[model samples]
Target: RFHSFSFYELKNVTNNFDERPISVGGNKMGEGGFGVVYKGYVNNTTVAVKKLTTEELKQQFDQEIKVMAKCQHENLVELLGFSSDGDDLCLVYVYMPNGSLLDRLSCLDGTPPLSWHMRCKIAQGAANGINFLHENHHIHRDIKSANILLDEAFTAKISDFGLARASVMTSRIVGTTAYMAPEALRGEITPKSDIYSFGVVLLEIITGLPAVDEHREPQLLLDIKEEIEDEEKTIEDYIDKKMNDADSTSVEAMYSVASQCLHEKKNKRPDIKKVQQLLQEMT
Candidate 1:
């Protein structure tokens, strides 16, 4: 039940998508494989307008809109409306004031880093959101911290449904090398593949480090696992030192789920329901 808007109306809301004197780059939230997202206001209500730019306009446009519309879930971003004007395929959503999880990790907009318990809560919400997608037989295809947006309350709102992979917006949009599953590029995708990607997302949560790096690897999981090994304390002392609120006791609980999601054997990974169950227990 999304509202349909004229392209002109959407444009007016964003002020012709112009850059302010300080930042033409200012109103523009961020760029991605599909199109750029701009911040706008309508009747005192802020929203995010995502302009779809790709070869498969009509087909891909409806695909994303359909998925967003079907998502009545609280953990998902609400689709405000769309501009079906010819090729623009502009989609608008409730603007997430806190931006994305990745930006928060870096303390974007001079914001303070997220607390440890907050990170745990975000992961649980993400697990719930991703589970909703999986149960619908929909594949997120692209999953990462950048896609997991936070609301004013820091609730995880998973946005940007992945259409079929031919367009840049769908598959190769962002940092896939880091978050992608081994079977992802081989033309094989499954619910478990999403688990793998979310697994990496958990790593991003625990460590403040970006998932993308040339020399670094996910084998670091082994190192942390080993560090927590043989000692009387199973708590993972290794975490992003930037946050002072980290309690290793809970860190290990999150780390446990992250490890399971990252299992090499796809079948070995847990499903979204089980993942959700695990997080609920943590709380």
Candidate 2:
């Protein structure tokens, strides 16, 4: 059901393991339990390559491939192909030059950051992607900004399914610490689990603040919300410092939606599909 290729073939496509790896594309982008990800170019096309380190990840790796192999959507990262040979398990995916939303919003780099419209669009796209997965009975489990990639056109794609889990209408704990819903953190994740994480990501996009930044004064989720609600806090002030001027109305609207998503009660969190519709209505 999946393709496998020789290590030699991969090396050949990458240009004889060229030391001066032409940065025309294919640079290590990020890392996780899966392996290091690099933006690479093959046959004049850009793609992402996730090369696994050993056979230990075979089970998870196969599951990720199987899930993505049959799924297709504009908001989900496309799986170009896969390679499972000897000790190498590589996955080739579409390239995202802009990198993850987490890096862009927080990094001090000079690249143009996301604006109000772009932010809303990204949020909408990501929500739609998640909604698709949930409807199909697949739980992303890991729905952090690090897993959300932005392409050259600012289109958003949800990536990193290595931690995804499937079930028959079952609930299980899954996802990262800061973004997990109460039920999920306690080992009871459902579609609602994704709704909870989506809410947190929406908050991050709106406030340009980490879900849990312990270094800041009064560094807790409650304290962070209080700071965000303060009267002196204008959209520009909380917005990613790197982003340029954006529509104040859109920013406010996005903030309001994000607030709803971050509600303490798990059941109170709006569904991703509803979230997507709400965001789409804004634009």
Candidate 3:
């Protein structure tokens, strides 16, 4: 069951909503359609505090709390508690000190580049989390780098269950465009859709580039396909320069797995379990 907290409880935990609300950098961790996130401390323990923005988000917030409360895994972010005070609804989560996979991959604000082995570890961890969700009959409608949080040790933790649904039968044309499968873009939802999004994230991990570029063009798969057809470039050309010492065999394996996941036909994409297995065997 989801743990509910009173307004006073939340205020007490968050220093009356005045101190340590934002991240260490003096800015929100991130904001989404649901709300903004802050870094907070409760009982000397670090936590992520999310404040729902509008009354309209109450339903979604409640749903997310329920979903998160029911699901627990090392690779999935844990929901600590929630509070509903008048019109304010807030969620508390285990703090991810290293921030998000997006921030690390993008090297934002001088964040260090992840080593190739660490990238593989993170990817496999995320796949394990997503596979667990699928095995439990849940679909993470949103699977992107930004939704993948990293702890102090850089372990990947899948977060943001606001768009998650219980059944694979549920269909909706929601999520970040750059990570959405073609069928998902057309309102078709399936576990495969999440796999497709994960493929995009894998590409981002390999290339250290955004899923889509400034011109609205996809970064990795599309470019790689063109390069293959033109016979003028190699997959190595598309690999992140930061992975200068990445093992060739491991890189090839990841490329193959990512390509399979990005297949246009949803049914053609490997299931999360299969993806997890492949990633496990990569090293």
Q: How much does each candidate deviate from the true structure in C-alpha RMSD?
A: 4.1, 3.5, 2.6
Per-candidate Cα lDDT values, in order, are 0.78, 0.74, 0.82
TM-score of 1: 0.87
Q: Put down candidate 3 lDDT per residue, 1-283, tens digits, no spaces.
A: 6568887777766656553224353636677667778767777888888887354377678778877868899999999888886778899998998988988998877777999999999999999999889988899999999999999988899988877878833344678988888888888768899998898888888888887787644343445655654868777877899766688899889988888998888988899989999999996
Q: Name the best candidate (by TM-score).
A: 3
lDDT for model 1 comes to 0.78
Off by over 4 Å in 1: 20-25, 164-175, 215-237
Per-prediction tally of clashes: 4, 3, 0
Question: What lDDT tens digits, residue by residue, belong to model 1 across residues 1-283?
Answer: 7788999998899888865331334788887677788889988999998876356656778788878766678788888898876656788899898989999998876788899889989999999998888777787877888889999999998887745222111354333666777677555756777888898888889988787764665344333444455664344455888888877667777888888887777889898898899888877
**TM-score-based ranking:** 3, 1, 2
Q: Is candidate 2 or candidate 3 better by lDDT?
A: 3
Query: lDDT per residue, candidate 2, 177-262, as tens digits?
Result: 88877777777756777776777788788777877887886554434555677755555666666566667788777777777777
TM-scores across all candidates? 0.87, 0.85, 0.90
